[PDB]
Every structure is written in C-alpha cells, then in structure tokens.
Amino acid sequence: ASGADALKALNKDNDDSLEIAEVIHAGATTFTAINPDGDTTLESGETKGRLTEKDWARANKDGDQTLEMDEWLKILRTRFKRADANKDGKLTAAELDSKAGQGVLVMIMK
C-alpha cells in the first residue's frame, strides 16, 4: 500500500501523518489479524512477507519459538524510528512511501 492508502485507512485525527500511538495500535490489531490458529502468539510461518529471519533474531531473545505482542511491537517501533527521516515523531505519506516506511506498513496493514 502507498502512504496515501495508509493515511486513508488509519489516520483519524485530522492531520496528514501517522504518530506512534496510531502506528502501535494498528500494529497490535495486525498482530491479531495475521494470527489464524487460535493461540496467542506469532510463529515464523505466520510472519512471512512482514518480518525477516534477522528480525526474529533481534526481537525473540527469551529462548522460545514464539513472537509475543511486545516482541512484535518492538520491531514496529524500531521501524517507525527508521522511517522518521526528520525525527519529528510523525510519518507523512512521503515518509511512509520510502523503503523504510514500507516496512512499517507491512506491520500495521494486513
């Protein structure tokens, strides 16, 4: 999806950017949206096309084979900061359209 697409679906506060509260919340809903087996965790087979193998290495450090909500969202907040080019806490459509911004979108839109 484009940055304009993401703003159409997720932005509700009469601006033209996504902030950390909007991004984390959408990331939490997407966590549930991509979990179809009825448990409470994400496995490597459920994150294909959204997380890489190295993403699991930097987030999953408790020794298990499961991604909990906080581990999932920690990757998201890091991608948020990587896409925040001018570091103002807001992600415009142009910032969401960057290669780093696209990494945010795959975690907040199913």
Binding status of residue 85 toward a copy of itself by CB under 8 A: no
Residue 104 sits at the vertex; the CA angle it makes with 102 and 109, to the nearest 5 degrees, is 90
Q: Site for a copy of itself (CB under 8 A): which residue of 8, 25, 58, 110?
A: 25
Q: Site for a copy of itself (CB under 8 A): which residue of 74, 98, 100, 106?
A: 74
Q: Which residues contact 80 (CB under 8 A, 6 or more apart)?
A: 20, 23, 91, 104
Q: Compute the least distance from the CB of residue 32 to Na ion, in Å.
A: 27
Residue ranges of E strands in the chain: 17-18, 91-92
Q: Which is nearer to La ion, 7 or 103 (CB)?
A: 7
x/- string (CB under 5 A) for La ion, residues 14-53? Answer: -x-------------------x-x-x--------------
Q: Which is nearer to Na ion, 56 or 80 (CB)?
A: 80
Note whether 43 and 35 are within 8 A (CB): no
Is residue 72 classed exposed, middle or buried when 0-12, 13-18 and 19+ CB atoms within 10 A define those classes?
buried
Binding status of residue 88 toward Na ion by CB under 5 A: yes
